[PDB]
Amino acid sequence: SQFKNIIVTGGAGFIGSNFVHYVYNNHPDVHVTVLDKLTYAGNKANLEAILGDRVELVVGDIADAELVDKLAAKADAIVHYAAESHNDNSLNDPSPFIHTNFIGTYTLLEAARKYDIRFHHVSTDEVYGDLPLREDLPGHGEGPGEKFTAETNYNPSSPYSSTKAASDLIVKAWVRSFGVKATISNCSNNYGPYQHIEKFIPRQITNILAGIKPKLYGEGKNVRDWIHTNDHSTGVWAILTKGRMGETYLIGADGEKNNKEVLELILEKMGQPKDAYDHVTDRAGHDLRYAIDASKLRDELGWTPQFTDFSEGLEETIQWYTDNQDWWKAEKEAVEANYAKTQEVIK
Amino acid sequence: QFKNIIVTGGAGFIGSNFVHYVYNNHPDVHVTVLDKLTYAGNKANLEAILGDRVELVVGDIADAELVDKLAAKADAIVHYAAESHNDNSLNDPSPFIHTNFIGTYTLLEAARKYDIRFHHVSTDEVYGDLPLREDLPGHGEGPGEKFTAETNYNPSSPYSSTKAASDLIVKAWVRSFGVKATISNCSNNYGPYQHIEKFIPRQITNILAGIKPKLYGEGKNVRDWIHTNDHSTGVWAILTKGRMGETYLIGADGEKNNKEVLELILEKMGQPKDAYDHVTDRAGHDLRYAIDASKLRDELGWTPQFTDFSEGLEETIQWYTDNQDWWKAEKEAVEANYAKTQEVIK
Numbered sequence: 001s002q003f004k005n006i007i008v009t010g011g012a013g014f015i016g017s018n019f020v021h022y023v024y025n026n027h028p029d030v031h032v033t034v035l036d037k038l039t040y041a042g043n044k045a046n047l048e049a050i051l052g053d054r055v056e057l058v059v060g061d062i063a064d065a066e067l068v069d070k071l072a073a074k075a076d077a078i079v080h081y082a083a084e085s086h087n088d089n090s091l092n093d094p095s096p097f098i099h100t101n102f103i104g105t106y107t108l109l110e111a112a113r114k115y116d117i118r119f120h121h122v123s124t125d126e127v128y129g130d131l132p133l134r135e136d137l138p139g140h141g142e143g144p145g146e147k148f149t150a151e152t153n154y155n156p157s158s159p160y161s162s163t164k165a166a167s168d169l170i171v172k173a174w175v176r177s178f179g180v181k182a183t184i185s186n187c188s189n190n191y192g193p194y195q196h197i198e199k200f201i202p203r204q205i206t207n208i209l210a211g212i213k214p215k216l217y218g219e220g221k222n223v224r225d226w227i228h229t230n231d232h233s234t235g236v237w238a239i240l241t242k243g244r245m246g247e248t249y250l251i252g253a254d255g256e257k258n259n260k261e262v263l264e265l266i267l268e269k270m271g272q273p274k275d276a277y278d279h280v281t282d283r284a285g286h287d288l289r290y291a292i293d294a295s296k297l298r299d300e301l302g303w304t305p306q307f308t309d310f311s312e313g314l315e316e317t318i319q320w321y322t323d324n325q326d327w328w329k330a331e332k333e334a335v336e337a338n339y340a341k342t343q344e345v346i347k
Numbered sequence: 348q349f350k351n352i353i354v355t356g357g358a359g360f361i362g363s364n365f366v367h368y369v370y371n372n373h374p375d376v377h378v379t380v381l382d383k384l385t386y387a388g389n390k391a392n393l394e395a396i397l398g399d400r401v402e403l404v405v406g407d408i409a410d411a412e413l414v415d416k417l418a419a420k421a422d423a424i425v426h427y428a429a430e431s432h433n434d435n436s437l438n439d440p441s442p443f444i445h446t447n448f449i450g451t452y453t454l455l456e457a458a459r460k461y462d463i464r465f466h467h468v469s470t471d472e473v474y475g476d477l478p479l480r481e482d483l484p485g486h487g488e489g490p491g492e493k494f495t496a497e498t499n500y501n502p503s504s505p506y507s508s509t510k511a512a513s514d515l516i517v518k519a520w521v522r523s524f525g526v527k528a529t530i531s532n533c534s535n536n537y538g539p540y541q542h543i544e545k546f547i548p549r550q551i552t553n554i555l556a557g558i559k560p561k562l563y564g565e566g567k568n569v570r571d572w573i574h575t576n577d578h579s580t581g582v583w584a585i586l587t588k589g590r591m592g593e594t595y596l597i598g599a600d601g602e603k604n605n606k607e608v609l610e611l612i613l614e615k616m617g618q619p620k621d622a623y624d625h626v627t628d629r630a631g632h633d634l635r636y637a638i639d640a641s642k643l644r645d646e647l648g649w650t651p652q653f654t655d656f657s658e659g660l661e662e663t664i665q666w667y668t669d670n671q672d673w674w675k676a677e678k679e680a681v682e683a684n685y686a687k688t689q690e691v692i693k
């Protein structure tokens with residue numbers, strides 16, 4: 001690795017911790033400093049095993065300029081995962097999204113500019129808004145613009161996706177105006193070990209394990225492009241070390257599936273009746289379909305996803321939450337209670 | 348269809364002109380200006396018309412408590428408040444992040460709370476830039492050779508990116524919360540009351556002050572000029588007849604490169620064609636801006652009245668000439684500020 005001392009913000013979260021583990025296991029010459037605020041989503045247990053001389057955990061806010069400047073001064077790269085990442089929380093209270101996603105990114109960019117160090121912005125495909133279902137597209141999803149590409153127009157639907165898109169925009173502006181050495185990645189829905197139980201797949205799995213019925217927003221026709229967090233990690237690493245400055249790369253593993261189909265699979269794999277779940281209040285402004293065309297990343301950086309078998313990936317994920325119930329058991333009640341405030345069983 | 352509107356940034360250039368427009372053509376509407384009076388805010392821009400129709404409240408749009416107090420008594424918010432200079436955004440972006448994004452967010456929440464009309468005044472800079480006409484197959488008249496409502500966002504600077512970012516949350520607030528918002532992206536405004544840090548006023552007042560006009564590089568950059576008066580009627584049309592959630596582009600089809608604009612100014616002011624200095628070019632400088640305002644024209648019937656730039660510029664030059672006391676106290680400071688980052692090319 002060309003970078004020997006990197007800072008990984010949000011490294012105590014789901015995707016970020018997976019990345020830190022990836023770096024620890026595949027790039028031993030890299031020292032990692034994780035800067036994480038440890039919000040409801042941050043969990044030290046996600047990093048505990050590897051904390052030591054190679055990985056340090058610094059508890060703080062990415063909006064804390066003084067702290068960021070102290071860390072940035074000793075780093076040669078920043079991989080930025082820190083963010084409020086739940087659409088449902090953003091619709092309930094946008095405040096933290098404004099602070100962390102936009103002001104936080106801005107604070108990091110100024111540090112990167114000050115020390116002139118590499119900067120990789122980790123973002124989402126949600127900045128592009130949503131797409132119609134394949135059955136309603138003239139190209140069945142295979143035509144131009146029927147999937148997201150690096151040229152797709154930004155059109156975020158929620159406080160969450162809009163603040164992320166907003167962060168993406170200043171990153172690009174900092175590149176053009178100040179010459180900041182940044183790259184951006186927008187990837188599809190990640191799934192796998194360590195995902196907070198507030199998220200779709202982990203919520204259904206743990207709900208079942210906890211004797212609670214899974215929850216499906218509306219009829220569950222919405223489509224998401226699933227990718228295993230492990231492939232997201234290798235994608236980010238490829239962009240970080242070989243990406244073209246100022247460029248955006250889309251990360252996806254061509255795994256489109258509707259929520260209903262995913263939930264049924266979970267129920268089936270966990271030996272539960274097909275209708276053993278509840279339809280609940282649909283999400284306001286809910287995005288219909290997400291789909292990523294990762295040709296640029298594949299073709300230009302030689303990256304390829306290894307976990308293309310969703311059924312198998314999901315199987316392993318269900319097994320993980322089953323063998324690690326102590327990891328989430330104490331959060332179940334609060335999470336569901338929070339959802340009860342805005343979600344009710346509809347028809 | 349609104350009687351008590353809040354006009355943020357109403358003590359500035361475009362905003363104050365909008366206030367004058369409402370004062371003159373809609374005397375039944377009460378206007379409450381919320382302006383922080385930064386280096387760009389000027390009471391003189393409103394002093395003559397302050398009264399029963401117009402009141403000035405000095406404050407920050409990021410001041411949630413103040414905004415809530417005012418929003419509780421309004422039926423609409425026309426949002427002009429912003430840090431508007433690219434060059435200042437390059438020297439210190441902090442106020443841009445604060446006012447343009449946090450400020451807009453603060454206003455959106457107030458609009459959401461009271462469920463009132465919100466019109467976001469924005470810029471064509473959110474789309475990034477375009478190649479010169481000479482380098483386009485359609486010579487600027489072909490598809491994608493001008494900005495449209497479908498053009499993707501691609502801001503080049505802290506200023507344009509914070510504006511674009513604000514446009515994005517405005518739209519998200521419409522989709523997610525049903526906020527009654529509309530957005531407008533306008534090309535370069537010019538006319539009376541524009542701060543002398545801006546291109547046209549700067550050249551005009553420099554000549555009046557016996558100072559050399561300043562041209563970035565060789566002046567190849569293209570701007571689509573529109574008189575602020577046409578921008579005012581555009582915003583009014585959108586505010587009163589626009590469709591919720593829609594974005595409208597405002598432009599008068601007046602593309603000109605900086606060099607020819609400066610030359611016209613020199614000519615009109617009796618100065619030699621070469622009596623100016625080339626100065627340090629702007630980092631990440633946007634090449635060409637061009638607006639296709641077909642949507643606004645087609646759907647709302649808006650038609651620009653000041654399409655004769657030569658005549659518009661002449662009157663603008665005359666205004667700065669007739670109102671030198673309005674800008675003289677700032678000339679030295681503005682030129683001294685520029686000197687910190689710009690020098691004559693030689």
Ligand SMILES: NC(=O)c1ccc[n+]([C@@H]2O[C@H](COP(=O)([O-])OP(=O)(O)OC[C@H]3O[C@@H](n4cnc5c(N)ncnc54)[C@H](O)[C@@H]3O)[C@@H](O)[C@H]2O)c1
Pocket residue numbers: 009010011012013014015016035036037038039040041042043060061062063080081082083084085086099100104122123124125164186187188189190191196
């Ligand atoms: N979940 C997904 O599928 C997904 C897919 C694509 C892109 N992304 C992006 O990937 C990144 C990580 O996503 P995630 O799912 O792992 O989120 P997460 O909710 O699991 O974790 C977010 C992490 O950031 C930390 N954090 C929050 N605010 C902070 C602040 N102000 N300062 C420092 N740390 C702060 C939290 O404590 C937590 O560890 C985000 O930027 C997200 O937008 C997420």
Ligand SMILES: NC(=O)c1ccc[n+]([C@@H]2O[C@H](COP(=O)([O-])OP(=O)(O)OC[C@H]3O[C@@H](n4cnc5c(N)ncnc54)[C@H](O)[C@@H]3O)[C@@H](O)[C@H]2O)c1
Pocket residue numbers: 355356357358359360361362381382383384385386387388389406407408409426427428429430431432445446450468469470471510532533534535536537541542
């Ligand atoms: N100048 C142009 O050609 C132009 C063209 C298109 C769009 N726009 C947009 O039009 C709007 C007005 O532009 P302008 O040229 O008149 O700008 P300006 O610099 O002349 O004035 C900005 C005004 O906002 C006020 N302001 C700044 N920060 C504030 C805050 N935090 N709270 C309250 N008031 C604050 C200033 O005091 C000032 O009166 C902006 O949103 C700008 O992005 C400008």
Ligand SMILES: Cc1cn([C@H]2C[C@H](O)[C@@H](COP(=O)(O)OP(=O)(O)O[C@H]3O[C@H](CO)[C@@H](O)[C@H](O)[C@H]3O)O2)c(=O)[nH]c1=O
Pocket residue numbers: 084085086087088123124125126187188189190198199200201203215216217220222223224259283290
């Ligand atoms: C929590 C939950 C979710 N859903 C649905 C809503 C969505 O269509 C789908 C997935 O929802 P979520 O897990 O919240 O993920 P989603 O909104 O798609 O966004 C995720 O993926 C994005 C990238 O695609 C990231 O940027 C976000 O940070 C991340 O949270 O499942 C349900 O039906 N029931 C539930 O209980």
Ligand SMILES: Cc1cn([C@H]2C[C@H](O)[C@@H](COP(=O)(O)OP(=O)(O)O[C@H]3O[C@H](CO)[C@@H](O)[C@H](O)[C@H]3O)O2)c(=O)[nH]c1=O
Pocket residue numbers: 431432433434469470471472533534535536544545546547549561562563566568569570605629636
């Ligand atoms: C101040 C100054 C500017 N210029 C050039 C740079 C630009 O190409 C052009 C106009 O510069 P400015 O007056 O700063 O305007 P510009 O950057 O185009 O942006 C304006 O127009 C935008 C909309 O197009 C607004 O959003 C901005 O708030 C407004 O300031 O003239 C010079 O050549 N010399 C100068 O002294």
